[PDB]
Design a protein around this ligand. Sequence first.
Ligand SMILES: [Mg+2]
Ligand SMILES: [Mg+2]
Ligand SMILES: [Mg+2]
Ligand SMILES: [Mg+2]
Ligand SMILES: [Mg+2]
Ligand SMILES: [Mg+2]
Ligand SMILES: [Mg+2]
Ligand SMILES: [Mg+2]
Ligand SMILES: [Mg+2]
Ligand SMILES: [Mg+2]
Ligand SMILES: [Mg+2]
Ligand SMILES: [Mg+2]
Ligand SMILES: [Mg+2]
Ligand SMILES: [Mg+2]
Ligand SMILES: [Mg+2]
Ligand SMILES: [Mg+2]
Ligand SMILES: [Mg+2]
Ligand SMILES: [Mg+2]
Ligand SMILES: [Mg+2]
Ligand SMILES: [Mg+2]
Ligand SMILES: [Mg+2]
Ligand SMILES: [Mg+2]
Ligand SMILES: [Mg+2]
Ligand SMILES: [Mg+2]
Ligand SMILES: [Mg+2]
Ligand SMILES: [Mg+2]
Ligand SMILES: [Mg+2]
Ligand SMILES: [Mg+2]
Ligand SMILES: [Mg+2]
Ligand SMILES: [Mg+2]
Ligand SMILES: [Mg+2]
Ligand SMILES: [Mg+2]
Ligand SMILES: [Mg+2]
Ligand SMILES: [Mg+2]
Ligand SMILES: [Mg+2]
Ligand SMILES: [Mg+2]
Ligand SMILES: [Mg+2]
Ligand SMILES: [Mg+2]
Lengths: 260, 188, 155
Amino acid sequence: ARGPKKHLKRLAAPHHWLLDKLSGCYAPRPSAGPHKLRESLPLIVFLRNRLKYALNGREVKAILMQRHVKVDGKVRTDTTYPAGFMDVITLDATNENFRLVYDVKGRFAVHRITDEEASYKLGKVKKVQLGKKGVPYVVTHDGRTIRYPDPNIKVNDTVKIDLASGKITDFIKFDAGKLVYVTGGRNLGRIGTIVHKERHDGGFDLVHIKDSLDNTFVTRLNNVFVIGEQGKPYISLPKGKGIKLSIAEERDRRRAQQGL
Amino acid sequence: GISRDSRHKRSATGAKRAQFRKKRKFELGRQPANTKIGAKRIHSVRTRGGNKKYRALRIETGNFSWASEGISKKTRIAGVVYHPSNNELVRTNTLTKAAIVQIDATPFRQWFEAHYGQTLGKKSKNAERKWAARAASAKIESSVESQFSAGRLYACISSRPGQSGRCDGYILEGEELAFYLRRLTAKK
Amino acid sequence: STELTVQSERAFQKQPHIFNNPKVKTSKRTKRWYKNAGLGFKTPKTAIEGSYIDKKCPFTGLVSIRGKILTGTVVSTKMHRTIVIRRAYLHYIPKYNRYEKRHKNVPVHVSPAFRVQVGDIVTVGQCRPISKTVRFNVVKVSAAAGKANKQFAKF
RNA sequence: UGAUAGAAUAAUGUAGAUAAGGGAAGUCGGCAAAAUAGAUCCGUAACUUCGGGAUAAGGAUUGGCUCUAAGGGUCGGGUACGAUCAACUUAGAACUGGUACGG
RNA sequence: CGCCCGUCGCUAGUACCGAUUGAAUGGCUUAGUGAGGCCUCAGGAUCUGCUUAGAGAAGGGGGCAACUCCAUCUCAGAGCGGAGAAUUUGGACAAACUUGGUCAUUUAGAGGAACUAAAAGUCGUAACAAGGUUUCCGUAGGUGAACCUGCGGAAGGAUCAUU
RNA sequence: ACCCACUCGGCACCUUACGAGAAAUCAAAGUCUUUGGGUUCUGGGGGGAGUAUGGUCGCAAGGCUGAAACUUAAAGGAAUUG
RNA sequence: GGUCGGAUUUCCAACGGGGCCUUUCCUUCUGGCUAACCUUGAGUCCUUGUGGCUCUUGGCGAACCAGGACUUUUACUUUGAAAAAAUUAGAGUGUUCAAAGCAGGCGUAUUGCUCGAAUAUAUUAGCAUGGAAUAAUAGAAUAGGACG
RNA sequence: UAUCUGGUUGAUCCUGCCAGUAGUCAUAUGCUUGUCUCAAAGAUUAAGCCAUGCAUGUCUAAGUAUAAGCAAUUUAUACAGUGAAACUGCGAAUGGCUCAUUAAAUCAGUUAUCGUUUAUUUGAUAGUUCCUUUACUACAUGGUAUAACUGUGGUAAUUCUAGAGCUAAUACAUGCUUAAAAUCUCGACCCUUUGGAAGAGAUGUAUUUAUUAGAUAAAAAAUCAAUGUCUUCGGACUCUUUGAUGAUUCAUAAUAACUUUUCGAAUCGCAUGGCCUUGUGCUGGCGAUGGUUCAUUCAAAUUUCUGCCCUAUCAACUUUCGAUGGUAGGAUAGUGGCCUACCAUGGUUUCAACGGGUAACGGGGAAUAAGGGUUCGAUUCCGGAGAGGGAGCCUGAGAAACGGCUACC
Ligand SMILES: [Mg+2]
Ligand SMILES: [Mg+2]
Ligand SMILES: [Mg+2]
Ligand SMILES: [Mg+2]
Ligand SMILES: [Mg+2]
Ligand SMILES: [Mg+2]
Ligand SMILES: [Mg+2]
Ligand SMILES: [Mg+2]
Ligand SMILES: [Mg+2]
Ligand SMILES: [Mg+2]
Ligand SMILES: [Mg+2]
Ligand SMILES: [Mg+2]
Ligand SMILES: [Mg+2]
Ligand SMILES: [Mg+2]
Ligand SMILES: [Mg+2]
Ligand SMILES: [Mg+2]
Ligand SMILES: [Mg+2]
Ligand SMILES: [Mg+2]
Ligand SMILES: [Mg+2]
Ligand SMILES: [Mg+2]
Ligand SMILES: [Mg+2]
Ligand SMILES: [Mg+2]
Ligand SMILES: [Mg+2]
Ligand SMILES: [Mg+2]
Ligand SMILES: [Mg+2]
Ligand SMILES: [Mg+2]
Ligand SMILES: [Mg+2]
Ligand SMILES: [Mg+2]
Ligand SMILES: [Mg+2]
Ligand SMILES: [Mg+2]
Ligand SMILES: [Mg+2]
Ligand SMILES: [Mg+2]
Ligand SMILES: [Mg+2]
Ligand SMILES: [Mg+2]
Ligand SMILES: [Mg+2]
Ligand SMILES: [Mg+2]
Ligand SMILES: [Mg+2]
Ligand SMILES: [Mg+2]
């Protein structure tokens, strides 16, 4: 009450951070920034819990203050910086590049990319609008304001951002048959192609998606993120490619590759 | 202070609602401006998020639009002659939105005579050519030209002085002018 | 509403920021703004070719329709431009595996483009707060016959 | 315009009044006096023979002035209707004053 | 030689009615008075800026004899403007107190009238047998007490029964 | 009018116990642990008590509505033997 | 059973979904689909089969996009989604066991490799969807009816 | 884990309770108590009262350093290191505690904002600063006025402060300097008119109002104010810029004005490269901090539907001092009887309104349980409320804040 909250109690953090129940009353509260709180991954969680480069927050701050980490090509000394979907994390030391893509269990995966992949990201067009002086601009899913977009670009399309200059390189429409990535809900992390899109004027457009093995699912349009054409994504997919194995077959391959 | 919420009211069934919490600042209201005429005096208000409001207290002139001519002029306000909400606002010459007033006719008459060459009521080659090109447009309306003899045009306030510190408005024309004429602004 | 005292109040009634030019005499003398509220609701011809104002109208007024679309039965047309509808529903009580009849009374603004009688089934659309109690506008009426064609005097 | 007049202004009287603080301690007894009081609005208990009790109890208002709003009569039609006349009741608002006003 | 009813009587306990304008606490509230800040009509200690502004004397340059221009130490005082405290008018918000009203809970009470328990008290024997007047129901009257009596009803009767 | 044979409706009766019930008994008190045709009312150990209180109806007598504190291991039903 | 009683398959059977025909709505007009091509100019070079063809004879262009001469309403049920985490049930894992916890495991410990942190349930209301039995509701009777 | 046993009788079978029986993250208490791990804990009664101490402050290369501070410093005679104090900035609205209020209220799930505010984060964004320009003001950089400090004090006492003297800024006020034309307004200068031009002004962004554009269905014309730019001078003319939404008076743009005129860098660290009219000249990097507006993030406020325990010995309630709706206005960040004026007579209710009770904060949940259920949830998470009781307000993006203030009790 009376103003914005600054603390995030442990057990109230997003579950996909995979923070331990005990060993702490609190969790890193993501700073304000490009991604929403529940959909973000604070830099301390990435550096400490996921990459194990730091044993505690003090080491995370020690790493960040020497300006090693950078999100989308900028240093980001902030410990609780809200990195999110398709953010590029570069460590000049270790010469390592990461893109934040959910694995098929709805959690950010430690996914490595090359320098050429790290040169760009993808953004989902959140809105297209005329600004002052009648200058058109698009707004992406990470809050980027990009002036003078291609007129063919509409909402729910995807743009390729140069990430050195905040410029669109090309774009993908939102049409049936195009590869998409599920960025929300219970199907988060799944990858498939749009079968069709049902409108529901006045609320909650839905999208029908089938994956490689012809498993279909329906998701709200807000969770659907276009990532390429039929096959051949514009980003390097993580291991699994969003197939969503069942628990029985998941177990089958566990016992398969654990016994050589 | 003044509380602008609905907890103090009865429910739609008539039930007496009990007190839920103390008064909050985010549901407040202020005292009315009760803007008068004369010797401009405007006090700023600090509102939510900063966002200055301007309380008009006894200001003099305003910007009034002649929509048929598509011009706006700074003009002195004479008095309030009609108010649909309260006849006491007319009585006290209080300026709110929608109050009918008379203003000057004076800057509007110089503009009209410089723009048409007609002398509402009763030298250059460029000026003459402009007037000739603007001919067949000077005839405005008998009910408006009649006011120019008295040097007082009927106008409606379209601004909220207690919110913005401005008495802006528009001259009355057509059915709106006839409505207020039949209603009260005749009969002296 | 071409007649019956549109200008029946101390202020002149008009659609805001719609200007009738006294000079250019187009053969209608009245520019009437209107919109389609959307969601497949047809704008009544009564709204298009009427002369009422109703700033709370979803076709000629400033309000907009967004949110819940509900149906109800008109139980009161006694207020001016406001009806009350009765929304009945069955409430399930799990312990007995049975339902009980329950109802709600919804106060709804009705545009003078619509004529509604107690008993008419009405489709109402959510808008911003109009009154203390009103949060809906009538967007559709379903009084076709009324079963009153065979209840008259017979020779 | 009648009732004897004039002068003076002791006590005690008769009639009329006023009173600091207290407030029935006076007295057989609140005797006597005081307090209340019109009107408008609000509120009104026990009990009851349901008719009352009731102006219960209890409380606000009240001037002047300047306005506003309601309430009326006659005279009138095509083998989208206005003149004109007149009355005192009620209600409200502004202003005003040594907060006074059923003076 | 069973069982069993009530009055009356001692003990104890529980509540009930109860003169006392009983009392106590709390909730809401009519009217009256009304702190405080806030808005507003004003007020204007001081605390200051420009153009100035006039006098008593100095330095410097100039007809070099007085005379003249700019600079400084002194103070009024005024056209000017801004800021501005005490104080202050009227409003809305409104604490709080006084009285009164009302609702709620708890509680004292002479005395009255009950119930229950408590073993072995007094008077009768009302019920259970046709309980010695069959019992019981409603209603009404009467009597120490159980009860009696009338009027209608029931059999749960002591009669399933008189073509 | 009576006789016979049917039929609908009714007051009942007799036999039997399918079935039910603790039994007495019951053609409904049956079609119930193989538990559901529709629907209204009422009860939840015995007393305190149909008392107290409030309300309401009544001229009254009284009626309708109607507790609690407290107390208690039984009260009760049907049948068996004496 | 040609891998010392375990693929394959109109031999089929038994379940379960869809389309079509039998008098059989699946409303609708604008225009890009150009039919599992209604109709096989040119061509059946596989030793015989009813499981595999090329620029097509203006070719019902009815195999989806966004606007109606466009909308009977409702209950019910199906699926989907949503219903924070912890908790509940539950998968994995020798916290020495266990309650727990979300860890951990394997090497070449010579310069690191790797599995996880699942899943279900979460009731009503709202949302999308299939169904059309059950139970309501509405329709053409002074025809003010539909088709056109 | 779908289980019953004792008790009415002389015995019987029933009804029926009493009693036993087993759990309880369910409290207390009695007796007893060796080990390891785990770890609730002044909720209930008194949101009763509190001694004391602590719980909110914060400085980087990067706002202000003349401490008469320490080290003394890297040309370092403007400063340069560290740096108390004190200005400035940010924070103190989070957390933590409690459950007193509170019964469609809180709250849960689900909606909306086309009905608003939003510090910070992130992204994007500012050549226009000219009273009436034919009256431009240092820009190699405006001004005073204050803290800490000096010194003189008052009070028993306070995180009290007074008088006098200094001096800074990213404090506080002021104030310029940057293309290029275009399009409009006005106007000395066109002789029989389908007769145009020197020359000034305006045009950034905010504010307020008015007005305008913000289109759209596939075919054609014949005359009429329309020889308004129709070329063998009646040779049937090469046309339509314009985004989004389910939807708008939306985004945005245009015109005439308006304003106690908003913003448009007088700031700081490091490095100090390049160039030629070598003037301590012109250009120049990597950051810091500011700032308008729009987006975003964090939110906030309001808001749609359905859902809450006992009670009728609570049946009618609201409407005088708003109850229910309309119009207008005011107020607000904004919608709305939120308030005001006028107007209308509405609104809820046996489908339980209104009232009363609660040893009620709501939910996630907990205990027990064959299934259905029953009871609990002050309490580790979410939401709400409060800080003895009321009310009021200041600063702030944000509080009706209480380790802020004001008043009353
Ligand atoms: Mg808090
Ligand atoms: Mg405003
Ligand atoms: Mg005499
Ligand atoms: Mg006296
Ligand atoms: Mg006295
Ligand atoms: Mg006496
Ligand atoms: Mg005496
Ligand atoms: Mg007397
Ligand atoms: Mg009396
Ligand atoms: Mg009285
Ligand atoms: Mg007897
Ligand atoms: Mg006897
Ligand atoms: Mg006898
Ligand atoms: Mg009996
Ligand atoms: Mg019979
Ligand atoms: Mg019982
Ligand atoms: Mg009983
Ligand atoms: Mg274990
Ligand atoms: Mg029992
Ligand atoms: Mg040991
Ligand atoms: Mg306590
Ligand atoms: Mg505690
Ligand atoms: Mg603390
Ligand atoms: Mg702060
Ligand atoms: Mg505690
Ligand atoms: Mg801030
Ligand atoms: Mg700094
Ligand atoms: Mg209104
Ligand atoms: Mg309004
Ligand atoms: Mg409580
Ligand atoms: Mg709870
Ligand atoms: Mg709780
Ligand atoms: Mg409590
Ligand atoms: Mg608080
Ligand atoms: Mg306390
Ligand atoms: Mg406070
Ligand atoms: Mg404290
Ligand atoms: Mg605090």
